[PDB]
Design a protein around this ligand. Structure first.
Ligand SMILES: [K+]
Ligand SMILES: [K+]
Ligand SMILES: [K+]
Ligand SMILES: [K+]
Ligand SMILES: [K+]
Ligand SMILES: [K+]
Ligand SMILES: [K+]
Ligand SMILES: [K+]
Ligand SMILES: [K+]
Ligand SMILES: [K+]
Ligand SMILES: [K+]
Ligand SMILES: [K+]
Ligand SMILES: [K+]
Ligand SMILES: [K+]
Ligand SMILES: [K+]
Ligand SMILES: [K+]
Ligand SMILES: [K+]
Ligand SMILES: [K+]
Ligand SMILES: [K+]
Ligand SMILES: [K+]
Ligand SMILES: [K+]
Ligand SMILES: [K+]
Ligand SMILES: [K+]
Ligand SMILES: [K+]
Ligand SMILES: [K+]
Ligand SMILES: [K+]
Ligand SMILES: [K+]
Ligand SMILES: [K+]
Ligand SMILES: [K+]
Ligand SMILES: [K+]
Ligand SMILES: [K+]
Ligand SMILES: [K+]
Ligand SMILES: [K+]
Ligand SMILES: [K+]
Ligand SMILES: [K+]
Ligand SMILES: [K+]
Ligand SMILES: [K+]
Ligand SMILES: [K+]
Ligand SMILES: [K+]
Ligand SMILES: [K+]
Ligand SMILES: [K+]
Ligand SMILES: [K+]
Ligand SMILES: [K+]
Ligand SMILES: [K+]
Ligand SMILES: [K+]
Ligand SMILES: [K+]
Ligand SMILES: [K+]
Ligand SMILES: [K+]
Ligand SMILES: [K+]
Ligand SMILES: [K+]
Ligand SMILES: [K+]
Ligand SMILES: [Mg+2]
Ligand SMILES: [Mg+2]
Ligand SMILES: [Mg+2]
Ligand SMILES: [Mg+2]
Ligand SMILES: [Mg+2]
Ligand SMILES: [Mg+2]
Ligand SMILES: [Mg+2]
Ligand SMILES: [Mg+2]
Ligand SMILES: [Mg+2]
Ligand SMILES: [Mg+2]
Ligand SMILES: [Mg+2]
Ligand SMILES: [Mg+2]
Ligand SMILES: [Mg+2]
Ligand SMILES: [Mg+2]
Ligand SMILES: [Mg+2]
Ligand SMILES: [Mg+2]
Ligand SMILES: [Mg+2]
Ligand SMILES: [Mg+2]
Ligand SMILES: [Mg+2]
Ligand SMILES: [Mg+2]
Ligand SMILES: [Mg+2]
Ligand SMILES: [Mg+2]
Ligand SMILES: [Mg+2]
Ligand SMILES: [Mg+2]
Ligand SMILES: [Mg+2]
Ligand SMILES: [Mg+2]
Ligand SMILES: [Mg+2]
Length: 245
RNA sequence: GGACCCGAAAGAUGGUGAACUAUGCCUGAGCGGGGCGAAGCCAGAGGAAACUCUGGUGGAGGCCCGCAGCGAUACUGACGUGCAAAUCGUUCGUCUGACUUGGGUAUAGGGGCGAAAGACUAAUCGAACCGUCUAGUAGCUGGUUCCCUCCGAAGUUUCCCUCAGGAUAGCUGGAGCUCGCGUGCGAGUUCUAUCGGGUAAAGCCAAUGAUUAGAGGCAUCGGGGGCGCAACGCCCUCGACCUAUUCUCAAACUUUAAAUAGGUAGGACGGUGCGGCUGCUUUGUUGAGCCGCACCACGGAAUCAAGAGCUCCAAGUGGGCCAUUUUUGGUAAGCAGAACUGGCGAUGCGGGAUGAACCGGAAGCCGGGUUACGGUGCCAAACUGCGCGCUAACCUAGAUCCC
RNA sequence: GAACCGGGACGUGGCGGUUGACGGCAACGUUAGGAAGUCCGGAGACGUCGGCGGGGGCCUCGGGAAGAGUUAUCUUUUCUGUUUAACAGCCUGCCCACCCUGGAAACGACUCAGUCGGAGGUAGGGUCCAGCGGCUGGAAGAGCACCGCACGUCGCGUGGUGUCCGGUGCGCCCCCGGCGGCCCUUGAAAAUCCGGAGGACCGAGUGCCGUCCACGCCCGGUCGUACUCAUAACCGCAUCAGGUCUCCAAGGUGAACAGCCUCUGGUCGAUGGAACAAUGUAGGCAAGGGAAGUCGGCAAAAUGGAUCCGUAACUUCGGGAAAAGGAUUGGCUCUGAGGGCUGG
RNA sequence: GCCAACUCAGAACUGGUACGGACAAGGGGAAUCCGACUGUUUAAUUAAAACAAAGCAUUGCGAUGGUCCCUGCGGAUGUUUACGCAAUGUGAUUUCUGCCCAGUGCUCUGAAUGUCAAAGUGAAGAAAUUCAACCAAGCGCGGGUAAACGGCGGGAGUAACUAUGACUCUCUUAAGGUAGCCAAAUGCCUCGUCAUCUAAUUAGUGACGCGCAUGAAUGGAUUAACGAGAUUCCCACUGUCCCUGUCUACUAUCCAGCGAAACCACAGCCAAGGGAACGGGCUUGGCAGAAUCAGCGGGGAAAGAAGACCCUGUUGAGCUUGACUCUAGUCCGACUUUGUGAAAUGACUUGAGAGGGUAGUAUAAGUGGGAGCCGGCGAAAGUGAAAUACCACUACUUUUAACGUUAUUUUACUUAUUCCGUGAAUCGGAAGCGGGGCACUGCCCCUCUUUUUGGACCCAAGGCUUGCUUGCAGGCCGAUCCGGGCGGAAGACAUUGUCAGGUGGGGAGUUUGGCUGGGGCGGCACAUCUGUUAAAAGAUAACGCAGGGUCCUAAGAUGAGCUCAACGAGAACAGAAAUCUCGUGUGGAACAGAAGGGUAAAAGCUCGUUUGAUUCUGAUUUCCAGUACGAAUACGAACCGUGAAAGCGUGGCCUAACGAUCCUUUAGACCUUCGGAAUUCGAAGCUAGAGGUGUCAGAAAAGUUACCACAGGGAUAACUGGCUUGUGGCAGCCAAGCGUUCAUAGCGACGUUGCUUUUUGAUCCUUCGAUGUCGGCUCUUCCUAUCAUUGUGAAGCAGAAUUCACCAAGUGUUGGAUUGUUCACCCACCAAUAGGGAACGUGAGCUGGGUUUAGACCGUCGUGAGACAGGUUAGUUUUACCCUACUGAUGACAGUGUCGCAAUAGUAAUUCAACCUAGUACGAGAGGAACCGUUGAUUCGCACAAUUGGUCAUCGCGCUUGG
């Protein structure tokens, strides 16, 4: 008869993201004439740590195309980039790690990261540490390109979408065991209030479908409907299968 | 309808709280002295080499002892109308981190928040607090205020999600009305004459069923012994079978069959003789009812009759209990359940020492007389009265229906 | 009394015109020493733990002088105080950082630990940075201590002497510097201030144009401000043994803001008196036995610091471990070892 | 030479061996269980094994998305992007994680139309409307999934002693418990069996295992280190105890001052009686003497609370689901937003064409004339149910366009709509400057200037041209022209709105009968019949006794004929039993069913004819209120059956076999009404049936609560007490037998009479505005049905020992292991280790181990919430100062004091050992007493401190730490 924890997540106010010390969103430059037709040079000024994010971020300074001022940007750092390196963004940029190129100019089999979904969205795919996308094939007829996402899914995107050559830096982070609850506490302290987690069978019936009973047990199949209403949809949602491979 | 008065656990609606506590966020603050000695580094020794070893340096850890801080294991100590609606004493866990803490800020009631105890959300939480709907509804508990006088019950029938309730009939009060005065439309009573019954008893030597024992006979058709190869050959034993007897039996057996109790009748609403009506009935004014006329009818058994009949409105009651006799279940019960009557309940009074039911007896306030049951050695009113026997208790002799 | 900040307006003097200073090889220095739209950097500005070093305050030892305490005996001894603010100038120059010469293996330099060097060490000479460092002005005229004269009811009167010279440190509080460890944790923003890139534009010859220089002048609103901050000034119905954030922090013992005693400061506030029955509450002891008591060793007792020797099974090799088990510990008189500065 | 600090290590000497001298400050060891560890938790009874945790595993999701909030609009995750976010399970490491997809879930690019709404389409009708086809999701079917919920049994045969079953086959229901582990925190029996630990062990450990009911991420097994966690043992230690004593402070105490509260019908001495079955009051007795002090915990069924256990109520509430009725969300279809075009594919139209046999070649598929049709067929017959010849139309399978309908797809446009980006900064077309090919002067193909470096980059130089002569100012190029789309993506799809179907414990509301020797479980005594209890009219109870929702066109109606069961005697197979003949035959047969009645030219059996099992309403009986329903009976008014007729027949031979209102549905009338008037549909009325309520005078209805609540109930359970005594316990009577013979020394079968209330039952009288619910500890008293001790009788009593019985309750009846234990069982001593009551004595006397709140784990059960006469661990014990009782203390008792008497009440002593008797009596031996006397001892009681021991704040003396 009580709202369950998963339901209470949506309202927020204690489950909102912790973003006080973050350095701002990481994204490409806004797509403009120079990047659409030629190339624009930038210089990496700093590689910084973004709290709550495994991948490091790189500060890049560009010369504004038509204003007398500096154009400052914050890119997701690709492995191998360094302070003082020159970064080239555009259709005519060379195929080197760190450069941002339109997918039409990236040959098949290349390794890219922070791939745009819509032309000009400034990067949504393959952004986490150690992740990358692979260019599969190009379709000149309809101006679309096929890529392989980190999850293994194959997606078709317009060939005008941009991507950064190389893989995201910071790879191999998750292979290290934490060994203790304190490390997880520190990890999630900067992400959101999602830890520790209480098992549903440890609760009373009033606050979870798994609650209750003189023994700890679910008492009914943990696989639930895709259309099950909130508060009832707990456990393995719309599972096509369960158990080991 | 507030509906005689007071009372629920709940439900609904609209608002108020995160000054406590829970969790997230922002910004500050706080945490002796010791123990163990991880990486990294310096030097030396052994060895053919590989490599091994030794002595130092250094100071890692959700590491250890432990102060402050934070918390609260045991005494199941103290206190337990306390210093205190959670405190006090000793003891105890942790103490550089998932650490402790101030202020700001966010989350508000079927909502929040929860390292999860249904925990916490201002001493309030398995749904807060405040006002209102609201005099919420209760077949349930408790109360329900002057006097005398008269009458005066019921715990039983049927129906009801009915079994602590209600309606219904019965029992009761009030109001009367119609008549009547012994010629009485009457009666919890007898008498006379007539009917029905299957209980008590009795019966099996009567049907059905149950059951003991012998006696006398019988078989080409029972089990055995003897005489026999067998024999529808012979002699006996036990069994069946038949006959006449015999012990003992029945709520769901019975020919017979009481006591008690049940029904009907004993005139004025009768009888007799004529005449009439009918569409009913008959072969038939043959019957069946009914209707007029005429005559007779001493009231047609006893006793009693503080009289008989009729109607309206309505209260309370619908838990009963006890006793002689009849009687079911049960070893039995101050158990449980039925029949008739009476009693207690609703009722005092004398007796049974004492007691709701036993015995007596029922009652306005008094004087006198006499009794009922029960008593007359004292307690304690009335004889140590007049008589006959029995008992002697070295077990507390024995001493009055229910008891 | 002596300073500082912000704002406003001018005057005098100074500074520049090679229109927009000079010096240094350099790091950079000097009180001044152009400039508008536009643009750029820095400060503000940041976690936690460990070692080391510097500064201020405190603690501590000795000598000089002033007063006081003890003095049956000893005590050149015991106690108290012996001070220097903001601000201005000059000097100095920690640990780093930076500059010039030069070119290094027989490698050297170097920290407690590290670390550094042909991307230029060691060495020699310099620049800069901190300071809660030094001297002077402030400022001895003040404050404090001591010794005197005077009114002796009301002179907040009047005068003198001193305030000096050294040591010491794993000492304590605060601040700072520079390294190192930790993170799947990397530990605010803005107001405001400073600096820089550029150079449109701008002036004269005995006066003009500028000037962040020195001195001089004027002004600076509104509200809070007593007191308690707790075993009686807040909450707990109270003058309630509860609860309520934080700053300062002496001596001795001792590892120690442990316990115990003491100095400054505070305080004897818990209604008082007599007696010392039982039963209680809190705190001890008890011959012999040693858990037989009890559901149960509940409670209590036993052990305990430091130094030396020694330490099993098992083990995830990290531990177990202070395993277990043994010895010592006072006082007094000595001995040995472990350092700094100066001088060829 | 001048200064400087406290650390370390040694050596003498020395004290009453004191010396971390106070303070400060681990007890240790050998194992089992759980949890890895650190961390967290029920503020105010549970700190734990519970929660969390790292590690392991599973599930969803690529933004037009997953999960979630929101009335709506819009939001959180998201300053995010799979090394991520979201939803679950297990719980370090090590090792392993077996079989099952049938069930419930979840899931799928699967077959298919079995079912499937609204809208839309077609037919008929005057229309309302009704019929058809088409028809989304979902459901059904199929497939997959167990680190999803969960499950892992039984049977038959089989090895050469037996036993088992390597092996083979089978059933439910998919499989049949694998690796492991165990009387476990999990095992009933159970205190299981063996070993070990002890003197003794329901405890601990190890081992065994058809294990009521162990078992593999509902995780199995182990595990170093850790733990205010549960357990066993050992050393040290002790006032826990034997067994108490003593000391210090504060109280209590007494005084001055000050000064409440709880509680209170009236009150307060007892024994018994009866009584509401436990009185302070009543009855009968015992008794009983002012006024006061300090304690005390027997009683006041003491106080504290309208019992929380249990039951009842037509009272809730938290939670669950396979309960009833709904609902947010979600999926799906239609219409709307919604505009502009082009093609395929499947049906529906018509229109031409091809094909076929259960036995035969064959359309003989179906139809008519065929005797005649256009050399060809019948005209003959082979199959034959039915003819080929010439005509079509009828059914089924099968191709394609002229017209038209319908449905599903593919695709085109952009301005509606939706989404993305930007400080809406170069978008579309063309042309110029440059580079390249060709061949010859044009065509074609390309580019917009920036890539060794951690620099800077803006506000135009220059040329041409005007005002007039420039303080300077105005134009073009530099900087191509033209496009009145900021740049893209999807796009009439999505989205919004309204209806329609599905899903929907996420959420709302509600329900979850009654009777009942408490309630539950069980049963139905709830409608209802027979016999009996039932007491000879009727009526009559119990969860008394023994039993009993249909069936029949005949098993109803009527007429006629006949007589049944059984037995006796006869007839081939044939007999106990087949069929047939005669005789007897009161029903001993049959009549649907339970039982009881009833019936013989019938009520039974056979046959003939039939539908009175018909129509109309009234009356009566049974039930009973003299209501209804059911059932039945007697007339009346009709139409019939049967019989010759009387007559009989209104269902079954009689006594049971069944059903209101509202609604629906059927039958009947030339019936009534639709209210402005007519006709026709439709609807509504009147009379009679049918669909049913079995809780049967008739709601529409699942659980759980140990998180719990309220109104009440002693109308009703869980103690004591009261009745009873079946059961338990303890006695007697008779005498068949036992006892070498002998019923009775000692016993007592078959029978039979009693007593007791320390057993357990039976009951429900008292107590539910509360009488504190096990056991132990302490303390007193009482009983005898006597264990020991004193005195006796008897014996199958030689002695010793033993047994039976009689007076007898004066005295005593113990220390320990296991268990919470009562109980039990062992060890040990002893004279003995008897049995019992006192509210199953005794919690304001203690304790709290167990039962019996809230936390948590296991097993079994349940889908679940949860349950559990199963196990386990942690879990607040309140108040006396009132009255009485009791213990002591003043006082009163007629001046004061001393010495005394004395009723009455209380009472106290107990048992054993040794020596001698005595190696005696007795006895064949073996063995083996006792009296007297002497000396000690046990338990208990009353005192006392010479000695020993204990006690210190003599604060008495000494020593000593820190200041
Ligand atoms: K809710
Ligand atoms: K959290
Ligand atoms: K968890
Ligand atoms: K559950
Ligand atoms: K589980
Ligand atoms: K009324
Ligand atoms: K607060
Ligand atoms: K904070
Ligand atoms: K609420
Ligand atoms: K009632
Ligand atoms: K008879
Ligand atoms: K008979
Ligand atoms: K009534
Ligand atoms: K800050
Ligand atoms: K650091
Ligand atoms: K200052
Ligand atoms: K400048
Ligand atoms: K002030
Ligand atoms: K204050
Ligand atoms: K013990
Ligand atoms: K025990
Ligand atoms: K810890
Ligand atoms: K822990
Ligand atoms: K704990
Ligand atoms: K856990
Ligand atoms: K989303
Ligand atoms: K799972
Ligand atoms: K399955
Ligand atoms: K399945
Ligand atoms: K199966
Ligand atoms: K495991
Ligand atoms: K613990
Ligand atoms: K007083
Ligand atoms: K008496
Ligand atoms: K009720
Ligand atoms: K509740
Ligand atoms: K649409
Ligand atoms: K729906
Ligand atoms: K639901
Ligand atoms: K009939
Ligand atoms: K009913
Ligand atoms: K319920
Ligand atoms: K008995
Ligand atoms: K009772
Ligand atoms: K009660
Ligand atoms: K005991
Ligand atoms: K505890
Ligand atoms: K005298
Ligand atoms: K005496
Ligand atoms: K003495
Ligand atoms: K003494
Ligand atoms: Mg579990
Ligand atoms: Mg707060
Ligand atoms: Mg500790
Ligand atoms: Mg009778
Ligand atoms: Mg009488
Ligand atoms: Mg009289
Ligand atoms: Mg550290
Ligand atoms: Mg010092
Ligand atoms: Mg002076
Ligand atoms: Mg400049
Ligand atoms: Mg207040
Ligand atoms: Mg020291
Ligand atoms: Mg919305
Ligand atoms: Mg479908
Ligand atoms: Mg097995
Ligand atoms: Mg285990
Ligand atoms: Mg009595
Ligand atoms: Mg009550
Ligand atoms: Mg109550
Ligand atoms: Mg009722
Ligand atoms: Mg006949
Ligand atoms: Mg009907
Ligand atoms: Mg004899
Ligand atoms: Mg006796
Ligand atoms: Mg006795
Ligand atoms: Mg289960
Ligand atoms: Mg006496």
């Amino acid at each position: 008869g009580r709202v369950i924890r998963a339901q209470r997540k949506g309202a927020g106010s204690v489950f909102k993201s912790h973003t006080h010390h973050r350095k701002g969103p990481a994204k490409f430059r806004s797509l403009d004439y120079g990047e659409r037709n030629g190339y624009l040079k930038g210089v990496v000024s700093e590689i910084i740590h973004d709290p709550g994010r495994g991948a490091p971020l790189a500060r890049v300074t560009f010369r504004h195309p038509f204003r007398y001022k500096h154009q400052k940007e914050l890119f997701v750092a690709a492995e191998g980039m360094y302070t003082g390196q020159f970064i080239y963004c555009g259709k005519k940029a060379n195929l080197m790690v760190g450069n941002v190129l339109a997918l039409r100019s990236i040959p098949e089999g290349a390794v890219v990261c922070n791939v745009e979904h819509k032309v000009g969205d400034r990067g949504v795919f393959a952004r986490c540490s150690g992740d990358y996308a692979i260019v599969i094939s190009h379709n000149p007829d309809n101006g679309t390109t096929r890529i392989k996402l980190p999850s293994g899914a194959k997606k078709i995107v317009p060939s005008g979408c941009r991507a950064m050559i190389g893989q995201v830096a910071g790879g191999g982070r998750t292979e290290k065991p934490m060994l203790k609850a304190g490390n997880a506490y520190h990890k999630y302290r900067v992400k959101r209030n999602c830890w520790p987690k209480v098992r549903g069978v440890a609760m009373n019936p009033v606050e979870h479908p798994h609650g209750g009973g003189n023994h700890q047990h679910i008492g009914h199949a943990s696989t639930v409907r895709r259309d099950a209403p909130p508060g009832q949809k707990v456990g393995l949602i719309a599972a096509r299968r369960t158990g080991r491979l």
